[PDB]
Structure formats: C-alpha cells, structure tokens
C-alpha cells in the first residue's frame, strides 16, 4: 500500500509571505495510464475539503495562481507564493493512482500575527437552574489571544484543581487571527457549596503577571 508522508504538520506564516508543504509517497504513484494523480486539498475551518491542485501541477478552476504544485515519482510540493488570511486551514495531499487510495496526514497553516493580543478572560458561576438539578459547572472563557501559548489553571480556595476539568480550543479563521479557549470545571452542588472562592488563572506572554478572574460564592 502507498504511504503518504506529509510535512510539516503545521506551518506559521506571516500575511504576504510564502509557504511550502511537502508530500512523499512510499513508492512511485504513476498510474497505469502514465498520469500521476497527485492532488492537493484545503479544508477551511468548518468546511468540507476543496480541490486545489490535480495531476501534480494543474490548478482547479477558481484557484488563485498563488498556489502551485510540483514534483514527480515520489516527491511533491505545494507552494503558496504569498499567504492570505483566507488560506487558513488544513492542507492534504492525496494519491489516486494505486488502490487503496491514500491521503497525507495534513498540514495546518497558521497566520503569524504581526501583533500580540491579550486574552479577554470571563468567569461564570453555576446557574441556579443547574444547582437545583444537583450540579455546579464553573466556566471560563479566554477569548481572542495571540500567540497560541497559554497556561490555564483552576483554583478552589487557592488550591489547584485537576479533576472535573474539560478544555476546548479554537484556532484562527479568515476573519480572526487570534485564538480562543474555553474551560469548564464541574462539581456537584454539595461540593460547590463546601468552598468559597473559584478562580480561573492564565499565564500569557502579554502580561508579566497571571491574568486572573475570580468570584466568591457570596
């Protein structure tokens, strides 16, 4: 079977700059008819994959000339001449020459934003509705930050809490070069009522001290 080895796994690039995405096949992918059915797809956030390049170097209709494909035999490269925010997403190579057909593992293109952005942090106590049902979830949003590197911890009366924590992440999209993250701490109502102070604490490049949001159960 043909293995497709695709690198890099992700790629930070400034607006206007170039990117190269590489694809290597474990054996020749020349189809019996002499053609090489090596294709490139882009999957934008929340969308299906869409065709960019076919037969190694042919641009599909509507695809900007910023995208170009090259290579032969077992080595192929997608080149983006200058990157735009709309180019964000995951690129995949594909060989359609030898069944079973196989995809590369993908390359996530990311924008290297020209300025940093501090997270906007919000914390939310359990609703009275949830408490009545016997649960207590505390939620923290950390919205619109750059760069990606962030550390986030929950503290209950000052003690770090590990269990019952769920974290979710969004990457950038064509209309937002920043990242956002959500974290939820879920307790029982009774456990919630055994403590006073609940804290969401973040460390990010944009401040020399922890960014803290806290409430007291009052």
């Amino acid at each position: 079977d043909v293995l497709m080895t695709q690198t890099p796994l992700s790629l930070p690039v400034g607006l206007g700059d170039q990117a190269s995405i590489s694809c290597r096949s474990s054996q020749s992918i020349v189809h019996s008819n002499g053609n090489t059915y090596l294709e490139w797809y882009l999957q934008k956030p929340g969308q299906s994959p869409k065709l960019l390049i076919y037969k190694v170097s042919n641009r599909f209709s509507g695809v900007p000339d910023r995208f170009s494909g090259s290579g032969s035999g077992t080595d192929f490269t997608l080149k983006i001449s200058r990157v735009e925010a709309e180019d964000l997403g995951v690129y995949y190579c594909f060989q359609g020459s030898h069944a079973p057909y196989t995809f590369g593992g993908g390359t996530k293109l990311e924008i290297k934003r020209a300025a940093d952005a501090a997270p906007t942090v919000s914390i939310f106590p359990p609703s009275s509705e949830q408490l009545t049902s016997g649960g207590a979830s505390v939620v923290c949003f950390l919205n619109n930050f750059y760069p990606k590197d962030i550390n986030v911890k929950w503290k209950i009366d000052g003690s770090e809490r590990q269990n019952g924590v769920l974290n979710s992440w969004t990457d950038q999209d064509s209309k937002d070069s920043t990242y956002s993250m959500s974290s939820t701490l879920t307790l029982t109502k009774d456990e919630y009522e055994r403590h006073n102070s609940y804290t969401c604490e973040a460390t990010h490049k944009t401040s020399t001290s922890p960014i803290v949001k806290s409430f007291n159960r009052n």
Partner: peptide, 11 residues
C-alpha cells in the same frame, strides 16, 4: 476529468 474529488458535500 483529471481529478478524483472535485465537488464535495457537507458530510
């Protein structure tokens, strides 16, 4: 002609 997955649905 020439390409495997030209149009896709939403899944």
């Amino acid at each position: 002609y020439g390409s495997s997955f030209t149009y896709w649905g939403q899944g």
